[PDB]
Amino acid sequence: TCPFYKKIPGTGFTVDAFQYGVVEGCTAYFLTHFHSDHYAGLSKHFTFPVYCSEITGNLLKNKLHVQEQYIHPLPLDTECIVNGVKVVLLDANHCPGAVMILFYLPNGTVILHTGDFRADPSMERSLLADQKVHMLYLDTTYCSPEYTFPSQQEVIRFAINTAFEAVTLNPHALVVCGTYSIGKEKVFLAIADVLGSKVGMSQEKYKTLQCLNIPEINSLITTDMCSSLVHLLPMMQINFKGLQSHLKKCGGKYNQILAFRPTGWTHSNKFTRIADVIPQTKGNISIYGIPYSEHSSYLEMKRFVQWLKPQKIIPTVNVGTWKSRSTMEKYFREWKLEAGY
Ligand code: NI
Numbered sequence: 001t002c003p004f005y006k007k008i009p010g011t012g013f014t015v016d017a018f019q020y021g022v023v024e025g026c027t028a029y030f031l032t033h034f035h036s037d038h039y040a041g042l043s044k045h046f047t048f049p050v051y052c053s054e055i056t057g058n059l060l061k062n063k064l065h066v067q068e069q070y071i072h073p074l075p076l077d078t079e080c081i082v083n084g085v086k087v088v089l090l091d092a093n094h095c096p097g098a099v100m101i102l103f104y105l106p107n108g109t110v111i112l113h114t115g116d117f118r119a120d121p122s123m124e125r126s127l128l129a130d131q132k133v134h135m136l137y138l139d140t141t142y143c144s145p146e147y148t149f150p151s152q153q154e155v156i157r158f159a160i161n162t163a164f165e166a167v168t169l170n171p172h173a174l175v176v177c178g179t180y181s182i183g184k185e186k187v188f189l190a191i192a193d194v195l196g197s198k199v200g201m202s203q204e205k206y207k208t209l210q211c212l213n214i215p216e217i218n219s220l221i222t223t224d225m226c227s228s229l230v231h232l233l234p235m236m237q238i239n240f241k242g243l244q245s246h247l248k249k250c251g252g253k254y255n256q257i258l259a260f261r262p263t264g265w266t267h268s269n270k271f272t273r274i275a276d277v278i279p280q281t282k283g284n285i286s287i288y289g290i291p292y293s294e295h296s297s298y299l300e301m302k303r304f305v306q307w308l309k310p311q312k313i314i315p316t317v318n319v320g321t322w323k324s325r326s327t328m329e330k331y332f333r334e335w336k337l338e339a340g341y
Pocket of ligand 1: 035
């Protein structure tokens with residue numbers, strides 16, 4: 001059944017709740033972003049109102065074939081009324097089109113649902129600064145102190161420098177980047193930019209990217225693999241067998257692959273700096289796992305919450321085990337006692 005952490009009290013609303021059938025008493029289904037664990041259930045047969053960003057609505061129409069009459073896109077940073085209730089969509093610093101949602105309940109309660117987010121100090125100057133938030137529905141993906149990772153900027157500088165060095169030393173090397181969802185487009189676009197190439201990809205993935213309102217996108221991507229020396233493949237193909245196979249397909253245009261797997265966290269983070277990352281190599285194939293995250297680190301999450309000072313926190317991730325739930329509740333209490341709220 002629909003879990004309580006997907007329901008907004010005092011409303012008929014749910015958030016990211018499309019796989020439970022008809023949720024009894026739901027008048028408006030919000031979707032924070034286009035990742036499959038969150039949209040699971042949607043299709044052309046859905047006939048209730050879906051509220052979302054413009055970009056998420058482009059993906060619902062073009063990729064899932066949801067009918068236009070049920071897609072209700074909202075502008076960001078704008079007070080809107082939905083079924084009698086004031087709401088605002090905010091940028092979540094996750095993937096393209098991902099939002100946080102502010103609900104202003106008729107009784108005076110203010111609720112923030114983060115969806116999935118990567119907390120940032122820039123959020124402290126949005127419309128969130130303007131009133132008190134009483135309840136926070138929080139993306140707790142990496143809510144434990146072991147989870148450190150570098151800035152996105154540091155990670156992209158490493159990737160750009162590594163790729164440019166490799167291809168200038170060997171003009172017959174191919175660069176491959178893995179993907180299995182939207183998000184992390186800076187990785188492949190920044191490397192193609194430094195090399196003077198477009199990124200080549202499948203027709204399915206090109207269609208997906210053309211829904212994202214990215215500026216000058218027609219100048220950066222292509223379905224012509226032969227004219228490109230940065231290729232995108234399914235994340236599943238980023239291994240030695242998958243890559244050897246792909247190299248056969250390029251007909252001796254290339255004699256070396258340098259591949260990137262943008263993971264979330266990996267336990268080489270509790271020891272190793274970004275400067276010190278090394279690839280796994282077999283023959284003429286090298287694979288780099290780079291810690292490019294679109295979720296908050298522990299310290300980023302803690303700063304956001306200690307700034308916001310909510311009265312009550314409802315985790316939305318890692319909620320399935322008692323040990324995880326109890327650990328998270330202990331951190332929430334530490335933060336509140338340290339900051340004095
Ligand atoms: Ni996500």
